[PDB]
Amino acid sequence: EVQLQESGGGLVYDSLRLSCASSRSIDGINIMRWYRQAPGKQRGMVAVVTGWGSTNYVDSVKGRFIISRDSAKDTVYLQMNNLKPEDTAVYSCNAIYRGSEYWGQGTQVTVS
Amino acid sequence: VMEHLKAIEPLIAEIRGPVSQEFEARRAEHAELIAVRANLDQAQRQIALIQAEEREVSARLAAAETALGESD
Amino acid sequence: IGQRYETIHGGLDSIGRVMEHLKAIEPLIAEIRGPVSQEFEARRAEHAELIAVRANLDQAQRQIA
Amino acid sequence: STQAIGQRYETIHGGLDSIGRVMEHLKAIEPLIAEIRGPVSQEFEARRAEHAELIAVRANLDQAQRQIA
Amino acid sequence: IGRVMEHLKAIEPLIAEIRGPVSQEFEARRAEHAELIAVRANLDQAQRQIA
């Protein structure tokens, strides 16, 4: 019954962050993930961290996404620039427990 | 007759989903629940054995304060 | 389940509206053989009778000759 | 939840299948009824012309009987 | 095309009488969905009990 909250989307051509907050069940989590869904397509991984917090991503953001973890805030961050016209999409998060998965809200992204 | 049906019927698809997904998401709890039904039964095992155990404790409890007066 | 009651409306759209359609194409049919009711029939005399005038034209010709 | 599992599969295909068929009785209704306008209100245009072209023949029906006169 | 009228008016009434019973079938487990969670309290009762 875990709930997670993103933020950081906005209109932008540079610097625009992503904040994926946390109000319940902090850091006592297994692996958690981010999704984005490019237009007319399904969803998929982009970048994840773990309890081990190993930083891995999806090839489209090599050196162009960096992922991190707090214990206290439980709110991964990133970088989103060096931009590509395909960057126009909706970004999100994910988390999972005990055999159940939980999405986030999911928010839009501007490349311009 | 088709333009609305080429709109309404495709829309019908994904208005099943999230609530139906929530149903399979809610019954993911049931995935535990139809599985974790027996946890009481295994719990019901120890509630008597320890009760059987503390009886020996209770039986041994008498062994405790009674030897007080007899030795005295 | 709030889900399907809405999905029923999606079906509820198809229930009457479709049948509300073709029965109204039934008068639209009436204007599909209706101009035909002025076409197939009123072509006929033209498809029938003005050949007689050519013969009447032909009637002139042997009168001419 | 096989009943809950199998229902979405059936309806989605139930949804996805019957929808396709009904377009082709539409997508065939505009072309096969298009020609009732095209070659058949041509039968208008030809006949709207056919009156006038045999009118020159309706003209032809009485030059003769006075040119012979 | 007239057939689809009566062909469907047998088809929509079916799922309409097929959707609802799913909901009550859902409504059934929905009742048991909560209860075993409340039964976990009995389990948690023993959990709290044993110590």
The bridge status of strand A44-49 relative to strand A56-57 is antiparallel
A8: left (phi over 0), alpha (psi -120 to 50) or beta: left
Backbone torsions φ then ψ of B70, nearest 5 degrees: -65, -45
Find out whether A111 and A100 touch, Cβ atoms under 8 Å: no
Residue type present at position D2: T
The bridge status of strand A19-22 relative to strand A4-7 is antiparallel
Q: Which two tokens stand for residue E46?
A: 């023993």
Closest CA to B35 of C45, D5, A49, A98: A98
Give the CA diameter of chain D.
Answer: 102
Q: What is the CA radius of gyration of chain C?
A: 28
* Cβ-defined contact of C19 to E5 (cutoff 8 Å): yes
Q: Measure Cα distances from B10 to A27, D5, E10 in Å.
A: 40, 20, 21
Strand partners, C39: none
The CA distance from A107 to A37, in Å, is 10
State the DSSP string of chain E.
-HHHHHHHTTTHHHHHHHHHHHHHHHHHHHHHHHHHHHHHHHHHHHHHHH-
Q: Measure Cα distances from E40 to B12, D62, E43 in Å.
A: 38, 110, 4
Q: What is the DSSP letter of A76?
A: B
Interaxial angle between packed helices C2-30 and B5-33, expressed in degrees from 0 to 180 and rounded to the nearest 10: 160
Structural method: cryo-EM
Q: Which two tokens stand for residue E10?
A: 């047998």
Give the CA diameter of chain A.
Answer: 41
Which D residues in the span 7-36 are in contact with B, Cβ-Cβ below 8 Å? 8, 11-12, 15-16, 19, 22-23, 26
CB D6: neighbour CB atoms within 10 A? 10
The CA distance from D20 to C62, in Å, is 66
CB D63: neighbour CB atoms within 10 A? 10
Residue type present at position B41: D
Find out whether A2 and A74 touch, Cβ atoms under 8 Å: no
Find out whether A53 and A67 touch, Cβ atoms under 8 Å: no
Closest CA to A75 of A1, A8, A11, A12: A8
Q: Which two tokens stand for residue A60?
A: 């489209």
The CA distance from E48 to E51, in Å, is 6
Find out whether A94 and A5 touch, Cβ atoms under 8 Å: no
* Cβ-defined contact of E26 to D11 (cutoff 8 Å): no
3-state helix, strand and coil shares in percent for chain A, rounded to the nearest 5: 5, 35, 60
CA closest to C21 among chain B residues: B1
* Cβ-defined contact of B1 to C7 (cutoff 8 Å): no
- In Å, how far from its chain's centre is CA A40? 20
Breaks (C-N over 2.5 A) in chain A follow: 13
* Cβ-defined contact of C43 to D40 (cutoff 8 Å): no
Closest-CA distance of chain C to residue B8, Å? 6
What lies within 8 Å, CB to CB, of D10 at 6+ separation is none
Resolution of the entry in angstroms: 5.8
Is D18 strand, coil or helix? helix
What lies within 8 Å, CB to CB, of A93 at 6+ separation is A4, A6, A20, A32, A33, A34, A35, A76, A103, A104, A105, A106
Contacts of C46 in chain D (CB under 8 A): 47, 50
* Cβ-defined contact of D4 to E15 (cutoff 8 Å): no
DSSP element (H, E) containing A15? none
